[PDB]
């Protein structure tokens, strides 16, 4: 390559190895200069301290700024030393790279500054040595997600209420609607559970209560639900992508059972389907998701650790299969022998893997207790495997949310500061109109703008 110039004579020497076999004109060296070395210590001071290095060492990488003829922009003539106006520390690592070819990266450095000084000198990040590259990439990743959170969000007719419809703590109508719909979800689910209570829809007194009015009590809620979903269909930034999301899926799953049951009872009386309707008559609990801030956090936590939960399920099936088979083959020959089949030993091994314990069926043979205890221990292990991952992800997500809120407050403060700075500059110009070197020409250009439009500036 171009960074092995110091070994150039050695290759020349290697040529002597094939002189006897050589057959050619031997084009002879092309008028090289200074046969004996007259390398001078070129000094590079970077806003302060000075680094001395050779010229061949500094020129072996011509694609960069310290190579090529670009550096001659920074030659400071009356002192004969390149006066770079950069940081006096990172430049040490850049010089180290020129010496070796594998640039390094210490930990105690801000990424923005280090990358700015690295790109200024024309270097590119991928040259970092493999030893420090991992830590560099991790730091770059965390700063990148910080700037992503920086660039995410800002606050901004009939379609405008959507802004208040995703931040209900914005207007009186939005907040009252949010609170009342939460109350309606709650009263619907409570209405379900109190329909189930024996004093609500059971023969408490056959000869005498069973108020069928619950049949109407839920209905209004469903109707109520429709209106806000209709609003979601009215103020929809996306007509189809909104449905592609999951919250609308929960909404429609909540809405449908009432309507499908009405259609069925208008046309059919299928046995076993009305109970399924009752079962599905509960998922408004998930409709509570918008009110609960932590529910979205939990959902994202589960979605993030999908692989871990999948391995949980696989290992659970593993253990259930193995231990249920062992139980059935080691306990089917007992007197009572409630282990009538492996599909029945599934329940025993799943209530002993979870360390639950019911005692409805327990082993009664010495060949049974051993594997029962081993199954309990293995259940502790298997179930405890993914919980640290899940909880770590949840804590991390909660931290991201809280830091994003603090960051948004910080961004509001920063934009306020920028507005204040512009106001201060305008007031300074006003004072200059009433009666530093830079401000002179700045106000001169402002006067030029004033005259080119013949309109003056007031407070």
């Amino acid at each position: 390559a171009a960074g092995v110039a110091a070994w150039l004579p050695f290759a020349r020497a290697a040529a002597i190895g094939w002189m006897p076999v050589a057959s050619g004109p031997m084009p002879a060296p092309p008028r090289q200069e200074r046969k004996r070395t007259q390398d001078a210590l070129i000094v590079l001071n970077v806003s302060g301290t000075r680094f001395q290095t050779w010229q061949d060492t500094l020129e072996r990488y011509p694609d960069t700024l310290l190579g090529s003829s670009e550096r001659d922009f920074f030659y400071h003539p009356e002192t004969q030393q390149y006066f770079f106006d950069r940081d006096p520390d990172i430049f040490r690592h850049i010089l180290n790279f020129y010496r070796t070819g594998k640039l390094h990266y210490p930990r105690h450095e801000c990424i923005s500054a280090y990358d700015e000084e690295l790109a200024f000198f024309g270097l590119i990040p991928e040259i970092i040595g493999d030893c420090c590259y991992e830590e560099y990439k991790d730091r770059r990743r965390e700063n990148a997600e910080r700037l992503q959170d920086d660039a995410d969000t800002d606050t901004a007719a009939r379609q405008r209420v959507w802004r208040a419809f995703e931040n209900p703590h914005t207007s009186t109508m939005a907040l009252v609607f949010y609170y009342v719909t939460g109350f309606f979800i709650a009263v619907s689910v409570i209405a379900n559970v109190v329909e189930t209570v024996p004093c609500g829809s059971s023969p408490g007194h056959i000869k005498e209560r069973y108020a069928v009015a619950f049949f109407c009590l839920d209905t209004a809620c469903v109707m109520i639900f429709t209106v806000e979903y209709l609003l979601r269909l009215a103020a929809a930034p996306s007509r189809y992508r909104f449905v592609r999301s999951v919250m609308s899926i929960i909404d429609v799953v909540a809405i449908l059972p009432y309507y499908i049951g009405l259609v069925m009872t208008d046309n059919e009386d299928v046995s076993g389907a009305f109970v399924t309707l009752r079962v599905f008559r509960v998922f408004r609990i998930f409709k509570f998701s918008r009110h609960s801030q932590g529910l979205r956090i939990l959902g994202y936590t589960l979605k993030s650790c999908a692989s871990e939960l999948g391995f949980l399920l696989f290992s659970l099936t593993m253990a259930i299969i193995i231990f249920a088979t062992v139980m059935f083959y080691a306990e089917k020959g007992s007197s009572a022998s409630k282990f009538t089949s492996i599909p029945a030993a599934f329940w025993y091994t799943i209530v002993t893997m979870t360390t639950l314990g019911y005692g409805d069926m327990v082993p009664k043979t010495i060949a049974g207790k051993i594997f029962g205890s081993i199954c309990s221990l293995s259940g502790v292990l298997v179930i405890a495997l993914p919980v640290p991952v899940i909880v770590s992800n949840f804590s991390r997500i909660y931290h991201q949310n809280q830091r994003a809120d603090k960051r948004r407050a910080q961004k509001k403060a920063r934009l306020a500061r920028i507005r204040a700075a512009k106001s201060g500059s305008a007031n300074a110009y006003m004072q200059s109109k009433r009666s530093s070197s830079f401000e002179t020409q700045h106000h001169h250009l402002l006067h030029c703008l004033e005259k080119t439009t013949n309109h003056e500036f007031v407070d």
């Binding site: 907040l175 009252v176 609170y179 009342v180 109350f183 009015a213 109407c216 009590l217 209004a220």
Partner: peptide, 28 residues
């Protein structure tokens, strides 16, 4: 803040009245 709570009071009393009317009309 509290005005929104009064708005809740209004909407809840309205819905309670209408559902009371609904439950009162049916058992004829």
């Amino acid at each position: 803040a509290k005005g929104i709570a009064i708005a809740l009071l209004v909407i809840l009393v309205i819905c309670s009245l209408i559902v009371t009317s609904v439950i009162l009309l049916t058992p004829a």
